[PDB]
Enzyme design. Sequence first.
Site, mmCIF file in Angstrom:
data_model
loop_
_atom_site.group_PDB
_atom_site.id
_atom_site.type_symbol
_atom_site.label_atom_id
_atom_site.label_comp_id
_atom_site.label_asym_id
_atom_site.label_seq_id
_atom_site.Cartn_x
_atom_site.Cartn_y
_atom_site.Cartn_z
ATOM 1 N N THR E 1 0.781 -1.329 -0.083
ATOM 2 C CA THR E 1 -0.049 -0.085 0.048
ATOM 3 C C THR E 1 1.076 1.235 0.059
ATOM 4 O OG1 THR E 1 -1.694 -1.173 1.214
ATOM 5 C CG2 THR E 1 -2.013 0.998 1.149
ATOM 6 N N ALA E 49 -9.370 0.587 5.284
ATOM 7 C CA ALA E 49 -9.923 0.696 4.116
ATOM 8 C C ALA E 49 -11.287 1.510 4.221
ATOM 9 C CB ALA E 49 -10.155 -0.215 3.238
#
Lengths: 228, 239, 213, 62, 201, 238, 240
Positions: E1, E49
């Site tokens: 990420t 998220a």
Amino acid sequence: YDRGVNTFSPEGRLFQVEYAIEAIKLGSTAIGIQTSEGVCLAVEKRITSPLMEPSSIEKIVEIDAHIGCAMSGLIADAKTLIDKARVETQNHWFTYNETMTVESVTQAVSNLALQFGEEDSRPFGVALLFGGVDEKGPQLFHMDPSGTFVQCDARAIGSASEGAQSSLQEVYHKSMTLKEAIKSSLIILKQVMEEKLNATNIELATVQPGQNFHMFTKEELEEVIKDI
Amino acid sequence: SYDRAITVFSPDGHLFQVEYAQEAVKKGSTAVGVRGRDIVVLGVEKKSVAKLQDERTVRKICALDDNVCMAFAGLTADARIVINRARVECQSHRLTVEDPVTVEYITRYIASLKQRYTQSNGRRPFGISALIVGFDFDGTPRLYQTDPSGTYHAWKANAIGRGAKSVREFLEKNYTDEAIETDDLTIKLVIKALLEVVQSGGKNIELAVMRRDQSLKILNPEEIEKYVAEIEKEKEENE
Amino acid sequence: RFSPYVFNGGTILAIAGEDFAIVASDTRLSEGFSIHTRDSPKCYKLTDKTVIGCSGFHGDCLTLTKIIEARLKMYKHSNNKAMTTGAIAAMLSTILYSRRFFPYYVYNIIGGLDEEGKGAVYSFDPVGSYQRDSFKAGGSASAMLQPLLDNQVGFKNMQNVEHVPLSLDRAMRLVKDVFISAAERDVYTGDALRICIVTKEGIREETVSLRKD
Amino acid sequence: DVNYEELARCTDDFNGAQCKAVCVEAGMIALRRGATELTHEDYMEGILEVQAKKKANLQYYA
Amino acid sequence: TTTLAFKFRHGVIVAADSRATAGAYIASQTVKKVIEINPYLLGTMAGGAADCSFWERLLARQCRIYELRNKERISVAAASKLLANMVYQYKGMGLSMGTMICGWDKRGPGLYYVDSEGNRISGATFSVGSGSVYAYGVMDRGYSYDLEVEQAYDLARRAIYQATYRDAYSGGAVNLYHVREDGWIRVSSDNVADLHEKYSG
Amino acid sequence: NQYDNDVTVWSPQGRIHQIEYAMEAVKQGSATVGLKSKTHAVLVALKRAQSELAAHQKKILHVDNHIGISIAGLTADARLLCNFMRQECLDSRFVFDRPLPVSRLVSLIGSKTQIPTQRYGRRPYGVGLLIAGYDDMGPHIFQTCPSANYFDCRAMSIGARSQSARTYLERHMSEFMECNLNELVKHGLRALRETLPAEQDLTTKNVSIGIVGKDLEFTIYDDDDVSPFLEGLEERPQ
Amino acid sequence: TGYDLSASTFSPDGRVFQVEYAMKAVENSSTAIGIRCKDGVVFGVEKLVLSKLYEEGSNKRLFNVDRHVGMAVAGLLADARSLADIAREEASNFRSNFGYNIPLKHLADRVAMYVHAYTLYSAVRPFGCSFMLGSYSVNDGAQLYMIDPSGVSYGYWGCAIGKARQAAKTEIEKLQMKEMTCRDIVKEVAKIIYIVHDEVKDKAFELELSWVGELTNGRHEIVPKDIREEAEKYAKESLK
């Protein structure tokens, strides 16, 4: 006999709602017309003096991108319903990821058209005109202080309501186009206003699926009036 | 607590306390104000001062931020809470979005507050009108007035208080675009407009300006007498 | 102590087609090492054109199913039309995030048609993030399904492989093969296999048994 | 043919003297109709013709 | 990420990968991380998220109502301040949120960085995530204020390529955006397996 | 008339006037007729639009998968008891996982509209409900009142000049039991054609018909699925 | 003037007019009587059918508060249903808390203090309902209590509430409470419920009967009015 603000009439009806209906009559006029292409809309600002700046006055605020509005009567009562109706549309969009339909807005306002009382003060003194284009096409709506919400194809309000409706069923049919209706409103406005019609008195507002947006700028209206 | 609807609809459609409580606006001090293209000027009149006593505590032109000036009519007591609540509101706007307070935002605050102060249970509506003048960010000057209805409404110049029809009728003979091509014409324009106002002996005329980047300047009784001098000498030139 | 979570299992499968969507789930509801039942289908009819699957902890599947089937009829009572498949995803994101600080333990998969006759399978997580995907697989056998659908539908890591789109008959032997060959090594994948096909013409259901151990 | 229940069912607050005038205006339009005899469609019109009040408007509902 | 954001002479460039794991297992390869807020704002995703999706979405609420009130599109620093005031009240409940706010303003280009702890700092360059420290290294060698458009695209794609190479938690697509004065515009989405043929030689 | 003031004050005759004035608000609404068979329940309303251009204000609104209600009188309070109606439906639908019978729903309307008829400063609800649905024992046609006194009838009608509808229904109540839907509906709206003056239609654009059945979920028809029902009626007599 | 409006104001002669208006509001409603025998309590309510109005079994003024306690309401009807829900809830509290079935004395106190509790404020109005309470338990016996809108609760062998009130309680002293079985007392009620309220006022009527006691084994229920049909078999033979 200052009675009990939530009391029925001998007829009967709510006294204070019936008194609230008469408060629309001294407000300024407006004209809505439903088109197959969109919704045109008209109002008069009612300039009081040449002291005042004419373009700061709002009679049309635009609720979402795709749902117009028109207010009447007492404006400062209308602003609260505007600002909260926007919150109800956004809450619809953030639970649902879709546009709130033009119908359910006026349920979401008219469910609190009547909240006055002492526990749990006065009803609102506005008569709104909602326009807009949802998936059901261009809808033109109308709500009152009583909350009695109904669709209206070509609605007038206010002081001019009687002569504007009465003169307006003569000039309306099912297959009206847009630029026909836009110059079909200002004839009625220049019949019903007391000041001379010019670039500072009125404002139009249109909303379409394919002509958007598409709000309300000046110098369009200069071309609009000079077509008379 | 206190559950009673004070302000209800009359059968001829009016609210009383809104459209009646403007009489307290009608029986207060007068205040006018014009906006120049560069420097604004507003001022209170009919001060009715004791003329041997103190004067800074009866000062009724104040600030919310330095960006925004005040002026009002009616009884000052109810106006004080509107001013302080307006100040507490316009400080948290600085705590948010980092531009200074635009004047239209703060007029929507006083107007919205005064509306819901009419709307609620057991509350007498405010009996003040007020003016909110300030040259905003990006240097553009404008003004608004209030209403006990709560309808903010942008004028080019002012007349509120006693004889608003008199001065408001007078400024139509002002609005030639020569006035104001100069800032001294704007200030002497305000004082010469307050000639038709109450006694105008150079005592009860308190004027204040704002030069679009400066903090507001309460002018001493120094050039008010000189503007009465060039105004009276101009009236000597008028014949 | 009283630990308020327990793992039940079950494995949900969804494949988005061109005009269809197949949602399938095993039925073995089991706690620990025991078997509570051999018939407990997970695929749930929400509307005519949207079928949800819910695995993980079972009581939250029941609770979540009942809250969703309530708010559907609230939307129908308000706005005179059914919820779109895109709206159920956002509403379920808000519901699954509404209990964030005492979370659900539920893996959700929503299949069903969109406005334009296409397969729109949405997937989730217990905290409530979501995305649109062509095919997903949750539950206890995700790692026994996902690279195989990548090898059959996703076409990853293959050279000189021409691209045919997924047909209606091919996806069925896909689902049958993945639940048999996945059910051989897994323990929480069980006897009866519910298969729901969402077409433009309604909801079709088909159930094929498997090995009985 | 006259119901006489039509009025009697729909008579509310109607005085015995008003009923005397109900047949009058019913007979008055029968006059200006040039009609030979009085009919219930002419009768029942006279019910709401004498009372009550109005004209005002018929709308919202029609 | 790995997300990264840097402003230059022509607006703001944002780039990110697409891989979002769950433990050692990878949930999916196509998670679109750079969340679209308005036609003139761009927010990203880091750490959790659903937290970034939810709180940036709730940021878009107050931004839209703000535009409906003041008739002006909201400034970037205002959006960052509202987001920090929303995040800060839950300090001590365990939100993991490493977003960034990008957009054009009256003062020109704009960029801010909002942590779940309550950090709020403006800056020229940023990179957020597990592979972020892998992105500052190559990102700070080719960067200056004066770059061309294709040069900034090649830098902001190369840095994501080194991030998805060296780190294990980064992979998938390379989603590249571009912010300008007239509202943002998507550039491209190049897969890493195709980019290895490009930058490998 | 100083005891006509509030809902608290009893009369010296024993009739609380606010309830009577709210009954007057019931009578001012338009006509609607609900009547049942042994196997079905049909309620038929008559819309009354404002002007020509405005669409007719609807009456029959969908409530549950079997419960449907008509309305006359006020509209906002109809949305209020409508939302309470939905919420008390899907409460027990959420808890017991069975639909509610009607005969224990209406006690929540009586105990809901009771308290705003007793305590000070609370008006009653101008309301005209004609409830219809299935429990397991068949159809039911109820009516309400602002005094909260609910009546299990076989047929009623409320609204403007609705007494003529009743005096139609009493000479056919011996024949309103066996017949199936297609003549039951027109047996319904014959009462509506007696609620009108005898010189204007009886159009298609105004009448709305709602039916609830066993193999038939509660359904509202609007002018166009109504157009197959209005065909083939008798002429109004001379 | 001014002394009748509010409930919380005494009148100068020394009574409360809103309570007195509440007493004669029940006076306009129809007659409903009750009586107990040595081992049971028999109710009877005459009900009004003019032409069509309602299906048989609508809005039954006989209620059922507990397993062994029932109502027989007369007056305004909606507030009587409110008292039915409240007395229902009070029997639920006693049943839940103290483990055994509610005696009729506590139930009469806890309801009558509410009916009194709405006669002390101008927040509410006094109720306009009056109701019977019949019951039977083997450690208790049959009790029959009577609550008026004022709040007074006490005990009858027999009572009557309605328009025809005095004429319908004139004849009860002819009957004997002590010896008779309630199975006689059913038709011994229905004979004068058929006799009182002569048919010139209202053309038709319809009868309800509810019967709790030793024969029903504590449970209160409506008798099957078709079963034994003892009412009109005696009542058509009771005109001469």
